[PDB]
Amino acid sequence: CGYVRALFDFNGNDEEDLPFKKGDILRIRDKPEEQWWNAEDSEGKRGMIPVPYVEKYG
């Protein structure tokens, strides 16, 4: 219920979007766009995360 998970490790590492990893945890915070939303990683880093690269956990 407002949580996603990345099932793929990305290479990119822009100084704007948070980096993802295989089997990473990312919480949903705000979904302004229709592809990348602002999710809070499991590190407290709140940035844009892909909805496709991730999955609906809860």
Side-chain angles (χ1 to χ4, degrees):
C1 58
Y3 307 89
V4 301
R5 242 244 237 159
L7 338 152
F8 232 38
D9 158 275
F10 183 42
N11 257 110
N13 274 344
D14 37 7
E15 65 181 329
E16 77 199 281
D17 200 276
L18 156 103
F20 337 102
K21 299 227 262 112
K22 61 125 263 210
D24 205 329
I25 275 281
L26 321 94
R27 145 179 92 192
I28 295 172
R29 204 140 167 290
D30 288 17
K31 315 143 89 196
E33 301 269 78
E34 216 191 32
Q35 48 190 35
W36 296 43
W37 309 327
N38 186 269
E40 187 246 328
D41 238 353
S42 66
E43 296 108 40
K45 187 154 165 130
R46 303 142 244 88
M48 256 151 78
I49 294 143
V51 172
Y53 233 72
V54 308
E55 194 148 42
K56 209 182 81 157
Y57 238 68

